[PDB]
Amino acid sequence: LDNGLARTPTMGWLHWERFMCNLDCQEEPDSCISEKLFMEMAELMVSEGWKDAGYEYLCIDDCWMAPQRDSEGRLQADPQRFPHGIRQLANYVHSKGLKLGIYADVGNKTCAGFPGSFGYYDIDAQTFADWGVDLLKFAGCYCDSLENLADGYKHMSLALNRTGRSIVYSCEWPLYMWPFQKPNYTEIRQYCNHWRNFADIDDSWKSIKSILDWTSFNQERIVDVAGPGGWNDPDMLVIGNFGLSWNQQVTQMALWAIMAAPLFMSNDLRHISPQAKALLQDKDVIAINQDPLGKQGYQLRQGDNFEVWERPLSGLAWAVAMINRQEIGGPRSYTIAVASLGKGVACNPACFITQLLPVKRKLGFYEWTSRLRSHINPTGTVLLQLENTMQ
Amino acid sequence: LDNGLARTPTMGWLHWERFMCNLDCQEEPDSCISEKLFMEMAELMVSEGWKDAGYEYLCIDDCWMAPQRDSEGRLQADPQRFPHGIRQLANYVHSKGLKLGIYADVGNKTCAGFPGSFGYYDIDAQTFADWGVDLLKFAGCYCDSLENLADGYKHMSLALNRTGRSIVYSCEWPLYMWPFQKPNYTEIRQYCNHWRNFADIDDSWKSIKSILDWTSFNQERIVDVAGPGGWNDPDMLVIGNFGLSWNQQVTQMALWAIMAAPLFMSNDLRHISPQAKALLQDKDVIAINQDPLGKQGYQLRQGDNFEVWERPLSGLAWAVAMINRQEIGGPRSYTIAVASLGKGVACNPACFITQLLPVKRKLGFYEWTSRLRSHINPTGTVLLQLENTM
Numbered sequence: 001l002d003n004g005l006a007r008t009p010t011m012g013w014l015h016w017e018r019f020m021c022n023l024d025c026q027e028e029p030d031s032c033i034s035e036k037l038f039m040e041m042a043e044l045m046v047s048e049g050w051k052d053a054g055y056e057y058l059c060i061d062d063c064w065m066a067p068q069r070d071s072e073g074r075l076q077a078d079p080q081r082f083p084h085g086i087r088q089l090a091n092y093v094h095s096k097g098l099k100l101g102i103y104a105d106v107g108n109k110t111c112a113g114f115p116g117s118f119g120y121y122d123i124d125a126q127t128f129a130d131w132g133v134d135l136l137k138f139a140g141c142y143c144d145s146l147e148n149l150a151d152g153y154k155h156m157s158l159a160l161n162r163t164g165r166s167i168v169y170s171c172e173w174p175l176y177m178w179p180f181q182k183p184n185y186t187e188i189r190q191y192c193n194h195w196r197n198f199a200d201i202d203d204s205w206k207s208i209k210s211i212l213d214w215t216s217f218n219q220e221r222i223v224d225v226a227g228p229g230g231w232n233d234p235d236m237l238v239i240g241n242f243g244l245s246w247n248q249q250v251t252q253m254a255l256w257a258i259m260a261a262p263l264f265m266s267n268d269l270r271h272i273s274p275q276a277k278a279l280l281q282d283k284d285v286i287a288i289n290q291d292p293l294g295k296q297g298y299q300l301r302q303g304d305n306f307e308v309w310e311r312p313l314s315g316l317a318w319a320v321a322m323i324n325r326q327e328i329g330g331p332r333s334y335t336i337a338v339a340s341l342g343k344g345v346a347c348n349p350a351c352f353i354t355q356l357l358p359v360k361r362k363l364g365f366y367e368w369t370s371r372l373r374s375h376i377n378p379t380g381t382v383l384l385q386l387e388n389t390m391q
Numbered sequence: 392l393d394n395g396l397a398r399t400p401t402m403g404w405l406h407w408e409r410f411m412c413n414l415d416c417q418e419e420p421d422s423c424i425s426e427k428l429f430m431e432m433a434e435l436m437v438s439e440g441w442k443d444a445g446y447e448y449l450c451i452d453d454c455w456m457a458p459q460r461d462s463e464g465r466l467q468a469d470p471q472r473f474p475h476g477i478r479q480l481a482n483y484v485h486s487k488g489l490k491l492g493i494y495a496d497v498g499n500k501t502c503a504g505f506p507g508s509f510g511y512y513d514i515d516a517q518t519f520a521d522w523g524v525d526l527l528k529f530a531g532c533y534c535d536s537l538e539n540l541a542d543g544y545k546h547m548s549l550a551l552n553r554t555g556r557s558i559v560y561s562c563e564w565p566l567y568m569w570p571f572q573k574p575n576y577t578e579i580r581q582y583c584n585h586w587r588n589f590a591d592i593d594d595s596w597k598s599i600k601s602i603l604d605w606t607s608f609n610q611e612r613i614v615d616v617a618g619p620g621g622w623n624d625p626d627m628l629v630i631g632n633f634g635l636s637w638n639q640q641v642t643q644m645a646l647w648a649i650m651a652a653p654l655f656m657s658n659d660l661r662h663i664s665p666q667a668k669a670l671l672q673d674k675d676v677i678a679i680n681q682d683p684l685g686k687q688g689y690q691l692r693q694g695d696n697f698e699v700w701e702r703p704l705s706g707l708a709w710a711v712a713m714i715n716r717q718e719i720g721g722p723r724s725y726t727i728a729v730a731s732l733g734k735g736v737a738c739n740p741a742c743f744i745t746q747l748l749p750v751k752r753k754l755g756f757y758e759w760t761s762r763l764r765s766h767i768n769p770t771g772t773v774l775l776q777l778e779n780t781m
């Protein structure tokens with residue numbers, strides 16, 4: 001989408017995976033979807049280093065709306081859980097230097113059952129602009145027609161543009177098109193800043209595997225269309241929660257960087273381990289994800305329960321990620337000729353290789369003819385950066 | 392098995408899940424199956440608190456043998472990887488106050504392809520006794536009929552007995568007859584100290600779920616046969632490795648206690664996090680697993696992606712474990728009338744409830760009318776001990 005936004009993958013926090021559609025502010029006050037939750041999460045984004053690391057957008061997912069529209073047909077925030085409304089929450093977020101994301105649906109209803117935007121696209125776009133929203137996640141539930149789906153996504157895109165307000169437009173168009181026909185990605189990119197391709201993530205290693213496997217399987221369709229202003233979205237980062245081991249968390253961070261994915265944390269910043277914080281705030285790995293060249297990475301190799309992925313970066317650098325998919329035993333040895341990496345360019349005549357994950361270590365100079373030997377933990381990933389040099 | 396052993400579930404360390412059948416001592420000398428590896432684990436079992444916690448048996452799994460038997464038909468350990476021989480390794484292990492487990496197969500080969508014990512049962516038993524072995528894991532690969540499977544497991548049982556040495560006998564009998572015929576657990580118990588029921592574990596949450604699910608599904612026929620001298624074996628603890636989250640590790644520890652399972656760690660004691668060490672050495676949770684009554688726990692409830700399991704303990708005490716099987720979102724609230732716990736006698740007229748996992752906390756006195764409210768992390772378990780006030 002040619003709107004001057006998302007020139008690098010958008011970074012921020014989105015409530016869905018960790019907080020879902022909890023409406024019980026009586027029995028579950030700390031996890032219910034409320035202005036207080038977003039206020040507190042905003043504060044922590046500032047005070048705990050997230051904004052400095054790059055996490056800029058504080059985004060509300062589904063279940064923020066009142067059951068009805070108002071007397072003017074405009075969307076409202078629920079009056080019990082968001083008494084001060086979206087406009088004032090938007091002021092609170094901007095005063096902290098952050099930006100605000102909100103959520104809406106192409107259909108008659110949102111996935112959770114609240115008012116959809118079908119037939120109100122221009123009204124909703126303007127309300128979002130008037131409120132000072134900075135990002136829109138636009139879902140695809142309760143749309144049974146292919147024509148409607150495409151029409152709605154296109155219409156809303158233009159409707160946002162017409163408000164004159166800079167709003168990152170996050171689409172679920174391709175995901176909700178899979179049931180009808182293969183998506184046209186040139187068209188989707190024309191209208192969207194990023195796009196969900198695959199099923200909702202959850203707090204499990206199974207879910208990570210499935211996203212990587214789908215992405216690698218479909219990579220000839222989706223990799224080359226990614227670039228500044230239009231990214232593939234493999235869904236939220238779930239590092240910091242309950243279901244991934246340390247190594248699985250490392251795999252997610254590594255591969256989301258390799259994949260030029262948007263980085264939307266879905267976790268609780270009030271209760272997050274120092275280990276997870278440091279991984280999520282890892283300057284070098286974020287720098288890979290945010291590389292200005294903006295070329296999405298891909299799977300180079302697959303075999304013997306190993307995968308090798310790589311991503312080209314600016315200034316002749318490459319990130320290389322090696323996964324061990326064997327879920328039994330101990331650290332497994334993997335070796336590759338550095339001339340097979342980075343299309344034969346990375347280490348010609350030589351490169352300097354720095355290991356970034358699971359720990360940071362300078363590995364040294366590698367000649368074009370030489371071999372990189374690495375040990376990889378089960379369900380873990382080793383992430384390296386290759387700097388082309390003459391020394 | 393009426394041999395005076397495994398009066399509580401056997402506790403120790405077994406190499407398989409973490410080290411498998413690595414024969415490459417040339418390229419990976421510190422992780423290949425060798426005399427050195429078990430020496431290191433033995434030392435660490437003493438110096439790092441494992442023995443004191445209860446982990447007593449240092450057990451060798453498959454891939455310790457030489458390819459051939461010797462010219463007398465006795466099994467041998469691999470000459471390069473185990474240069475001093477098993478007996479010498481047993482001497483070492485005993486000098487540290489520990490006990491030694493070895494591995495063998497009822498069929499024509501071990502699962503990894505080394506000499507099986509079929510037709511050598513009495514010879515092998517005696518060799519193991521002469522070596523000073525203290526435990527035998529006896530697998531079921533390369534056995535072509537149910538009759539010879541049963542015959543072999545029975546024969547070896549008696550053969551071990553007749554050596555006059557005390558040897559914990561770990562069977563895989565039920566696992567290998569399950570696909571063809573329902574097992575008679577009364578018979579298995581008669582011959583075995585514990586028995587593997589289900590597929591090999593690995594370093595994943597998927598594998599943990601599968602074991603729990605199979606165990607709960609089959610509980611009507613395996614729970615009541617367990618007791619001092621005969622335990623159900625849901626396989627090794629994999630806490631300390633790579634594939635389980637903290638909460639999934641907690642779930643394994645909690646449920647293995649509830650299940651009166653043998654506690655065989657399979658990990659690397661040279662590289663293990665303080666978090667995992669403390670969970671594996673948790674005095675209160677081990678005390679549940681080791682409860683002298685020896686009555687296996689069971690699933691009480693299942694619904695709304697929650698499970699409740701419970702185990703009766705000595706002196707009118709109970710353990711209760713609550714699992715959250717929903718793998719999305721955050722800590723979920725679960726509530727239950729304490730009168731539904733412990734068959735209605737745990738908290739009559741009252742009980743004192745101490746949460747043990749994921750952290751230890753006194754919860755206080757609960758009346759027979761009361762309700763236990765708890766929040767449980769996704770893929771996590773909360774473990775409580777109920778003390779009847781009387």
Ligand SMILES: *[C@@H]1O[C@H](CO)[C@@H](O[C@@H]2O[C@H](CO)[C@@H](O[C@@H]3O[C@H](CO)[C@@H](O)[C@H](O[C@H]4O[C@H](CO)[C@@H](O)[C@H](O)[C@@H]4O)[C@@H]3O)[C@H](O)[C@H]2NC(C)=O)[C@H](O)[C@H]1NC(C)=O
Nearest residue numbers: 001002003004005007158160161162163164165166167228
């Ligand atoms: C509504 O839709 C229209 C049409 O798509 C859209 O207008 C487009 O906006 C982009 C970016 O704002 C314009 O592209 C710019 O062109 C100018 C002049 O050539 C460049 O200077 C811009 O900067 C580039 O280079 C800079 C170097 O320092 C970089 O910092 C910067 O990131 C850019 O790479 C940029 O290329 C584009 O020209 C228009 N298109 C048209 C047809 O006018 C509009 O913004 C949409 N949204 C809204 C809210 O109106």
Ligand SMILES: *[C@@H]1O[C@H](CO)[C@@H](O[C@@H]2O[C@H](CO)[C@@H](O[C@@H]3O[C@H](CO)[C@@H](O)[C@H](O)[C@@H]3O)[C@H](O)[C@H]2NC(C)=O)[C@H](O)[C@H]1NC(C)=O
Nearest residue numbers: 392393394395396548549551552553554555556557558559
């Ligand atoms: C080989 O098999 C025989 C027969 O099963 C075993 O004998 C049994 O050994 C146990 C444990 O020592 C005896 O139990 C004990 O009995 C005494 C007194 O009755 C009691 O004080 C203890 O608390 C315990 O119950 C058991 O009675 C005995 N059974 C018989 C029938 O003799 C023997 O242990 C086995 N030998 C080896 C080397 O495995």
Ligand SMILES: *[C@@H]1O[C@H](CO)[C@@H](O)[C@H](O)[C@H]1NC(C)=O
Nearest residue numbers: 107108118142143144145148
């Ligand atoms: C919403 O419902 C109306 C009334 O039945 C219908 O006309 C319209 O097609 C529905 N919207 C979508 C996206 O199908």
Ligand SMILES: *[C@@H]1O[C@H](CO)[C@@H](O)[C@H](O)[C@H]1NC(C)=O
Nearest residue numbers: 183184185186187188189190
């Ligand atoms: C995809 O859409 C674009 C823009 O609408 C169009 O020009 C192009 O031909 C389409 N591609 C295919 C393969 O249909």
Ligand SMILES: *[C@@H]1O[C@H](CO)[C@@H](O)[C@H](O)[C@H]1NC(C)=O
Nearest residue numbers: 498499509533534535536539
């Ligand atoms: C072992 O092999 C022999 C010879 O092939 C065969 O007769 C016997 O049935 C086998 N025994 C078992 C237990 O599989």
Ligand SMILES: *[C@@H]1O[C@H](CO)[C@@H](O)[C@H](O)[C@H]1NC(C)=O
Nearest residue numbers: 574575576577578579580581
């Ligand atoms: C199981 O085996 C025991 C002991 O061998 C025997 O007494 C019992 O009757 C058997 N039960 C069945 C159902 O075959």
Ligand SMILES: OC[C@H]1NC[C@H](O)[C@@H](O)[C@H]1O
Nearest residue numbers: 016061062111112139200
């Ligand atoms: O119900 C909300 C839900 N809708 C569908 C999306 O794919 C999810 O990420 C989430 O936004």
Ligand SMILES: OC[C@H]1NC[C@H](O)[C@@H](O)[C@H]1O
Nearest residue numbers: 407452453502503530591
């Ligand atoms: O080959 C060894 C392997 N055999 C099968 C057993 O069930 C496993 O636990 C392990 O001991």
